[PDB]
Amino acid sequence: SKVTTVVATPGQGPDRPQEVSYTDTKVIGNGSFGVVYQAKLCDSGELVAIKKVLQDKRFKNRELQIMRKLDHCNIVRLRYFFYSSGEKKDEVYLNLVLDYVPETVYRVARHYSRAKQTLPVIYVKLYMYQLFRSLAYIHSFGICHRDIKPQNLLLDPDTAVLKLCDFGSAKQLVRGEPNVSYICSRYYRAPELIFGATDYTSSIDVWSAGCVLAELLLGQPIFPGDSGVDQLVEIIKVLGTPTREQIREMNPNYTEFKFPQIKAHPWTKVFRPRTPPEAIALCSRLLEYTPTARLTPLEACAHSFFDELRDPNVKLPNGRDTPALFNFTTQELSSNPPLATILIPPHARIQAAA
Amino acid sequence: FGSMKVSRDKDGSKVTTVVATPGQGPDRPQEVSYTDTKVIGNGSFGVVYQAKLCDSGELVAIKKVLQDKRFKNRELQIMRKLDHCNIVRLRYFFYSSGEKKDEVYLNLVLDYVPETVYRVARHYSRAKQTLPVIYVKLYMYQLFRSLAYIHSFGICHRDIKPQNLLLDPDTAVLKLCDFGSAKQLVRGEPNVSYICSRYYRAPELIFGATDYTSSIDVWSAGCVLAELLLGQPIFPGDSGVDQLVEIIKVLGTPTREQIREMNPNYTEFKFPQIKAHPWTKVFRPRTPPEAIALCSRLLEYTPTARLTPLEACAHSFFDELRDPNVKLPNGRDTPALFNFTTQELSSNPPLATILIPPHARIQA
Numbered sequence A: 001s002k003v004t005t006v007v008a009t010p011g012q013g014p015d016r017p018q019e020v021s022y023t024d025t026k027v028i029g030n031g032s033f034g035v036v037y038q039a040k041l042c043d044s045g046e047l048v049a050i051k052k053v054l055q056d057k058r059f060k061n062r063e064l065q066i067m068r069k070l071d072h073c074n075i076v077r078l079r080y081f082f083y084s085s086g087e088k089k090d091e092v093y094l095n096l097v098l099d100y101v102p103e104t105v106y107r108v109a110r111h112y113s114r115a116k117q118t119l120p121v122i123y124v125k126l127y128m129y130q131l132f133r134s135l136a137y138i139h140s141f142g143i144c145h146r147d148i149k150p151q152n153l154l155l156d157p158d159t160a161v162l163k164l165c166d167f168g169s170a171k172q173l174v175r176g177e178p179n180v181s182y183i184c185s186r187y188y189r190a191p192e193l194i195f196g197a198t199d200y201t202s203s204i205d206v207w208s209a210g211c212v213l214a215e216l217l218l219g220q221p222i223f224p225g226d227s228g229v230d231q232l233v234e235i236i237k238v239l240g241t242p243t244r245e246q247i248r249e250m251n252p253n254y255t256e257f258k259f260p261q262i263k264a265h266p267w268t269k270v271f272r273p274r275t276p277p278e279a280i281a282l283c284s285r286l287l288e289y290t291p292t293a294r295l296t297p298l299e300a301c302a303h304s305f306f307d308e309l310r311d312p313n314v315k316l317p318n319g320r321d322t323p324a325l326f327n328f329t330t331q332e333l334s335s336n337p338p339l340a341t342i343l344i345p346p347h348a349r350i351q352a353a354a
Numbered sequence B: 001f002g003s004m005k006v007s008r009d010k011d012g013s014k015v016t017t018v019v020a021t022p023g024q025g026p027d028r029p030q031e032v033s034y035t036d037t038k039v040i041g042n043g044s045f046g047v048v049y050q051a052k053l054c055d056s057g058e059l060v061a062i063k064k065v066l067q068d069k070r071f072k073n074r075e076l077q078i079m080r081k082l083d084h085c086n087i088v089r090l091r092y093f094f095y096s097s098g099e100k101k102d103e104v105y106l107n108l109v110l111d112y113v114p115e116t117v118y119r120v121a122r123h124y125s126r127a128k129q130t131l132p133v134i135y136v137k138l139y140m141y142q143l144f145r146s147l148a149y150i151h152s153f154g155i156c157h158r159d160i161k162p163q164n165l166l167l168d169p170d171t172a173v174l175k176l177c178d179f180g181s182a183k184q185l186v187r188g189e190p191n192v193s194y195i196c197s198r199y200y201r202a203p204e205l206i207f208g209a210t211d212y213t214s215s216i217d218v219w220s221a222g223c224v225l226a227e228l229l230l231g232q233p234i235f236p237g238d239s240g241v242d243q244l245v246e247i248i249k250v251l252g253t254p255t256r257e258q259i260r261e262m263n264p265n266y267t268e269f270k271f272p273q274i275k276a277h278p279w280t281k282v283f284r285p286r287t288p289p290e291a292i293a294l295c296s297r298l299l300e301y302t303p304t305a306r307l308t309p310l311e312a313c314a315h316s317f318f319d320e321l322r323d324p325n326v327k328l329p330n331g332r333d334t335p336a337l338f339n340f341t342t343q344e345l346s347s348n349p350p351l352a353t354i355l356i357p358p359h360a361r362i363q364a
């Protein structure tokens, strides 16, 4: 029962640090940047995840700065943050105290994959809808995640709530300002990134989201490959060879233009026969060569594939009610306010003033 | 646009007869018959089959790739001018009509090699064992020879990795294969930075450089050597940033100048300032110091700072191979290691004074 007490700063609000005590620490994750532990807050008994990262004393943490300003039901909440010293030297660590979430889309999808089972479409709808809401929210602040993948999509299986995490690659994209093309994990990288573009936009997150949707429908990654060339060939096999204008749209630079002219592969033949046509249609609208041609996250949320979620009688397979899905804010709808007419169904959020 | 002839020699045995063009010799079409076909490899580009030559009974590999009627096959054009003991030989090639449409397939008939460095390394890794250093020395030496050879023609492989290194376990002979990404690099000409397999990509490729040189093959070979010594890839990562982080952990943060050497265009300069990781702390205890030294001279941020393949061959890590009494653990003789040609030595002829040991110069 070893208790650890620190003076941590609330993730949001005023910089008024308070004493926080926790126990039952244990490693629950890792990365090239740091370690993630689980712990229990002594006062509330609530479980949290503490992401520990080496902090450059001379500069401020971008991940922390971005997290401090986010407040959305589909994004993991930053409860507190504090600094601790790494005895190994005069090394200082930034500790992000976040809400603990038990699963990830990666693990859940792997279970169904192994059991040679398909993840029920109701879950594919729920998870993808919530992912798009989180993207609509961060994109409205000009912030691009840049690492959308199954492992960064936390899930609470019982409530079916999805929470986007890991803002370690996130960055506000400013039109005209160049950005590195080596972010984003293999399998989920937008083609313009593979082509080395540095003028990409937030739409790279939409391509990644589309790769996640296809993977949940297929049961395996849709564009695998150990090299960029292999990945591109897998993309070309499905989307067909990119037009000269399309290549120009992605990155009007890359020399190699030698690529087997393959006709677009009918999106319908890509997935199993049982696959809902709406899911396929949404997919074709996310995985587009021309970045500007892809649906925006808010438009994706309004897609017909998510119509069942807007049904007043929808329920979770475990009998519970669906989680929050319609508590949109002005900020979240800012890219296209008129969509509220579709996004907030007649029965949703009905509340009188007594 | 050619065709084949299928039949049944005897016992129902299916025999395929084709008319192929010699790989190296002059264009004298020859009739080739083979049986017992079976897939032994794959790639987004094609499929590799194993087949048995009807008369010699010899096994060969047939790499089948879709041919673009638009231009010539770069892989074939390159394979055709190569002749080295550490590079898989192209016996002949022929076209076959893909019964799927008006699609034509180019078939490269190669010498068949039973193993790959990838499979061998995995066997030891699984058993939580490590490949004896003598094999590491032999395989890496032969890989550097093959690179000195293709580089002497200005040809960069661009996909050096364990799966592209064929091996004959008994003779310990290594043959480089898969020239599907290979290209002659001409100074001033831009080249795509999305080639090469993750884990083996040089940092300048990760940074999106298009003005890279053949030294990217040297970085990759260095990753293979480190991997054979470690039992696992040295710079793993699902994203480029993760890979850069693993690299920085070992090499330390790249100076502003080193960054300029790889690619003078990329933005992100924001990367934790880690100190150089003692290479000796990177490998298991008792790892030969010479192996660690060679690794540090191959895995350098500044491309021009890396050893050339010929220089690598002359490194002291390979001194044991030049010993007159060296033999394979199975008591057998080592493969050909000193039959260097003028072409192969062109990059630095004087290195021959080290490369060709005294005993190899005996008249007899």
Ligand SMILES: Nc1ncnc2c1ncn2[C@@H]1O[C@H](COP(=O)(O)OP(=O)(O)NP(=O)(O)O)[C@@H](O)[C@H]1O
Pocket (backbone or CB within 6 Å): A028, A029, A030, A031, A032, A033, A034, A036, A049, A051, A076, A098, A099, A100, A101, A102, A104, A151, A152, A154, A165, A166, A167, A168
């Ligand atoms: N709030 C959390 N609750 C429970 N588990 C978490 C939480 N945050 C992170 N993890 C686990 O820790 C893993 C790594 O955390 P993450 O924020 O991704 O750090 P990172 O290693 O630097 N980034 P990356 O590895 O590139 O995804 C995740 O993929 C999760 O499985």
Ligand SMILES: Nc1ncnc2c1ncn2[C@@H]1O[C@H](COP(=O)(O)OP(=O)(O)NP(=O)(O)O)[C@@H](O)[C@H]1O
Pocket (backbone or CB within 6 Å): B040, B041, B042, B043, B044, B045, B046, B047, B048, B061, B063, B088, B110, B111, B112, B113, B114, B116, B163, B164, B166, B177, B178, B179, B180
């Ligand atoms: N001559 C050969 N003898 C035996 N096996 C071979 C031979 N050539 C290739 N293979 C096997 O087939 C695999 C694929 O061959 P390869 O030439 O790499 O085709 P590819 O799949 O189109 N290229 P890539 O997948 O990008 O490495 C190799 O990694 C080997 O394991």
